[PDB]
Design a protein around this ligand. Structure first.
Ligand SMILES: CCCCC[C@H](O)/C=C/[C@H]1[C@H]2CO[C@H](C2)[C@@H]1C/C=C/CCCC(=O)O
Ligand SMILES: CCCCC[C@H](O)/C=C/[C@H]1[C@H]2CO[C@H](C2)[C@@H]1C/C=C\CCCC(=O)O
Length: 155
């Protein structure tokens, strides 16, 4: 449940790349071969939290999705409501140096997705260095993910 100490939301803004993940979703343990690195743009929201705008390629086009991360009452901690999945999730920035990487941890808080748990690696570049990949693997292990649940996302 750790949140980056002295979190500076303004320094967390801008362009990130979703470079790895690990989850307890059976769906991932199966459908990981199909997942690709996505760009995610982080900007402040009207409520003092964050809008996360992610893009991915389908056929000839780059689709855009936005997720509102509402502040959850300590800096670096957020909540996300998924109407499609009838669930709310806690999202925490556990660790970040702002300029190279962030380690995020998301967990179900309300609704049928309550059980859900996911670690995410954000990278400022599309090529995370080996030391960062090692950091993420170690982070995921600390969170209870086995090796075959950890996925590094190809560019
Ligand atoms: C960086 C973390 C955010 C990534 C989310 C990303 O924008 C969406 C990825 C989609 C497409 C690529 O793999 C599949 C298709 C994935 C399906 C995700 C659907 C989310 C629906 C629930 C919701 O988020 O409210
Ligand atoms: C067999 C039905 C479950 C589908 C499996 C699916 O890949 C899992 C999706 C998870 C993750 C994405 O949004 C959350 C986290 C979802 C929660 C899991 C099941 C939702 C069940 C919906 C319901 O029962 O009302």
């Amino acid at each position: 449940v750790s949140v980056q100490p002295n979190f500076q939301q303004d320094k967390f803004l801008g362009r990130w790349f979703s470079a790895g993940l690990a989850s307890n979703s059976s769906w991932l343990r199966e459908k990981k071969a199909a997942l690709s690195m996505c760009k995610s743009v982080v900007a402040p929201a009207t409520d003092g939290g964050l809008n996360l705008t992610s893009t991915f390629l389908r056929k000839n086009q780059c689709e855009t999705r936005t997720m509102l991360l509402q502040p959850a009452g300590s800096l670096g901690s957020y909540s996300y409501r998924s109407p499609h999945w009838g669930s709310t999730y806690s999202v925490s920035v556990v660790e970040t140096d702002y300029d190279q990487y962030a380690l995020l941890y998301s967990q179900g808080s309300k609704g049928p997705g309550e059980d859900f748990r996911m670690a995410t690696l954000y990278s400022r570049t599309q090529t995370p260095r080996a030391e960062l990949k090692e950091k993420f693997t170690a982070f995921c292990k600390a969170q209870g993910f086995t090796e075959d649940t950890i996925v590094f996302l190809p560019q």
